[PDB]
Each structure stands twice: as C-alpha cells, then as structure tokens.
Amino acid sequence: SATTIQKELENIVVKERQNKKDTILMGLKVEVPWNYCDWASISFYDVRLESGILDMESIAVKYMTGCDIPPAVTLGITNKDQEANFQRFKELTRNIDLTSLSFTCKEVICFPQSRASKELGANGRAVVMKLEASDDVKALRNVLFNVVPTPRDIFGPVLSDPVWCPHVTIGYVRADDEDNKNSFIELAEAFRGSKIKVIGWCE
Numbered sequence: 001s002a003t004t005i006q007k008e009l010e011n012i013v014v015k016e017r018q019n020k021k022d023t024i025l026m027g028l029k030v031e032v033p034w035n036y037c038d039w040a041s042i043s044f045y046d047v048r049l050e051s052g053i054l055d056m057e058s059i060a061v062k063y064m065t066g067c068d069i070p071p072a073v074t075l076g077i078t079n080k081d082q083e084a085n086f087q088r089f090k091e092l093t094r095n096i097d098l099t100s101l102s103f104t105c106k107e108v109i110c111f112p113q114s115r116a117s118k119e120l121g122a123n124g125r126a127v128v129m130k131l132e133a134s135d136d137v138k139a140l141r142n143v144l145f146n147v148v149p150t151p152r153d154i155f156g157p158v159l160s161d162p163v164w165c166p167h168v169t170i171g172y173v174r175a176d177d178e179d180n181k182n183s184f185i186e187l188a189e190a191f192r193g194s195k196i197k198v199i200g201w202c203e
C-alpha cells in the first residue's frame, strides 16, 4: 500500500512531468513496416485539434499527435542543459554501427492514460508496439545514462524500480472508445514479429 509520503511523491512526479518543457530526446530512429493507410479505419486523438488542453507546451500532452509520430525508439528523456553531454556521447560512440542494431516487434500494448496528461485536459492513450531489444541496445542505453544524466523513469508507483519497455509508439486514441481501441490493436497485432532496423539517432 502507498503511504502518505509515497502518495505525496507521486504528486511531485506528476507535476514535474507537467511543468517539464524544452527537453531533448535520446532515441534511435527506426523504419517501421506499417503505414498511415493501415490505420485508415481508426480514429486518432490529436491534441493539436482538441480543446481544453491547459498547457500545449507540456511534454505530457505535446507529443499526443494522433498517428503523426516519427518512427523511433526512445532510450531516455533528459533536460536541455544536458545537450552537450549527449553530443559528446554521440562522438564517443562514433565507431558503433547503429544500423546493425535491430528490434523485434513482440506485443501491441495500449499504455494506461497518464494522470499528468489527464489533468492537463488530454483524453488519449498511447498504443505502442513493445519491442525485444538486444544486449547491444540495452548496453548502449545503460552507458548513455552513465555519460548523460537522465531523469529516472517513474511511470508507476514511486517505490517500484523502472522497467524499460522499448517500444515504437504507433498512435494515440481516445481513452473512452473501446471499439476503436480494440480495432486499432487488432490491426497493429498483424505486424508482430517484424524486424525493425535502426537508422541512427533522432534529430
């Protein structure tokens, strides 16, 4: 059970993600086998077309743009002042062939609605494709966090240790439309087992 301090710490994590703006993405740009037309029957949730959003610049709602999402696998999200460390890490890993890295589409997961986005007026959940990352990718991410200070991912209880879920976000859908969500997941599940090639860092 969550204690008084643990519940208060969860309020801090939510508010920290709401106030967090102007951050950099340390991810791996990838090529996906699915296309926009594959989800033609699906209705998507785009905050740029919605009303009641309290802070369009907050990272908790800013990137909820329907299926208009760049194909990429996020390794970590850190602050803007760490951009020199991230540039230094990309030069330290200059001899690493990122194109040899590869992921495997395992399962389609609809992430729960984050409380940070819901408080900002968002009504969308992320439908992603969970990936199986190799040891090379896991080691690249761990050394990345060793060179570049990165905030700890706290998506659940503050007491639980973070479990990295490597994924490619396919699109956001409304949280109050189960038929549209189930149909999207069923169509996305047809791409399970597809091998995903990395092209390089996200720019």
Ligand SMILES: Nc1nc2c(ncn2[C@@H]2O[C@H](CO)[C@H](O)[C@H]2OP(=O)(O)OC[C@H]2O[C@H](n3cnc4c(N)ncnc43)[C@H](O)[C@H]2O)c(=O)[nH]1
Pocket (backbone or CB within 6 Å): 023, 024, 025, 059, 060, 063, 074, 076, 077, 111, 112, 114, 116, 126, 128, 155, 163, 164, 165, 169
């Ligand atoms: N439940 C749950 N959710 C998880 C988990 N892991 C990740 N998520 C994601 O958590 C979110 C919850 O708050 C959301 O539910 C869900 O959405 P995404 O995975 O699509 O992430 C948003 C994208 O925008 C960031 N981003 C993009 N572009 C930039 C940029 N230019 N600068 C800085 N940041 C950028 C992210 O890095 C991108 O992925 C998890 O384990 N469990």
